[PDB]
C-alpha cells in the first residue's frame, strides 16, 4: 500500500449528515434514501458514459473540493474518515468506488494516483 494515495470524489449529502449544509445549498433538505439514489443515478451514468465523474463532482458534490473538480489531493492512513480511507486504499489507480457511507454522507471515489 502506498504512504499516500490521491482521490477525487463526489459528495451527496443528506438532512440526517453531520453538517447538513454546503456550499451548494444553505440546507440540505434530501432524505438518506433520495442521497443513495442520487449516487447510484450518478454511478450508472459514469458507467455507461453519459456524465463525466469530475464534471457531475464540480456541479453537484455537497463537498467543497467541487471547485477543484472533486479533487481532495493525497492523504495517507488516519486523517479522512474510516470508511473513506478504507475504500480510497482498496482503489486502483483510475478505479471508481460503489456507494461509501461516512457521517458527512455518501460518497462515490476515484482513485487517481
Ligand atoms: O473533509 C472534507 N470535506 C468534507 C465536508 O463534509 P462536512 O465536514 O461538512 O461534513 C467531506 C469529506 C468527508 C470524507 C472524506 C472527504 C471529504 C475535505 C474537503 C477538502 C477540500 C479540498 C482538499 C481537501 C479536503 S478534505
Not at 463532482?57 to 481532495?72: E, I, N, P, Y
Not at 492512513?77 to 458527512?104: C, I, W, Y
Request: contains cysteine; hydrophobic residues 30%; glycine residues 8%.
Amino acid at each position: 500500500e502506498p504512504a499516500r494515495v490521491r482521490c477525487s470524489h463526489l459528495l451527496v449529502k443528506h438532512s440526517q449528515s453531520r453538517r447538513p449544509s454546503s456550499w451548494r445549498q444553505e440546507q440540505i433538505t434530501r432524505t438518506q434514501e433520495e442521497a443513495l439514489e442520487l449516487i447510484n443515478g450518478y454511478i450508472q451514468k459514469i458507467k455507461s458514459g453519459e456524465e463525466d465523474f469530475e464534471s457531475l463532482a464540480s456541479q453537484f458534490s455537497d463537498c467543497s473540493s467541487a471547485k477543484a473538480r472533486g479533487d481532495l489531493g493525497a492523504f495517507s492512513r488516519g486523517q479522512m474518515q474510516k470508511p473513506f480511507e478504507d475504500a480510497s486504499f482498496a482503489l486502483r489507480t483510475g478505479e471508481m468506488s460503489g456507494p461509501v457511507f461516512t457521517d458527512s454522507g455518501i460518497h462515490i471515489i476515484l482513485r487517481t494516483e
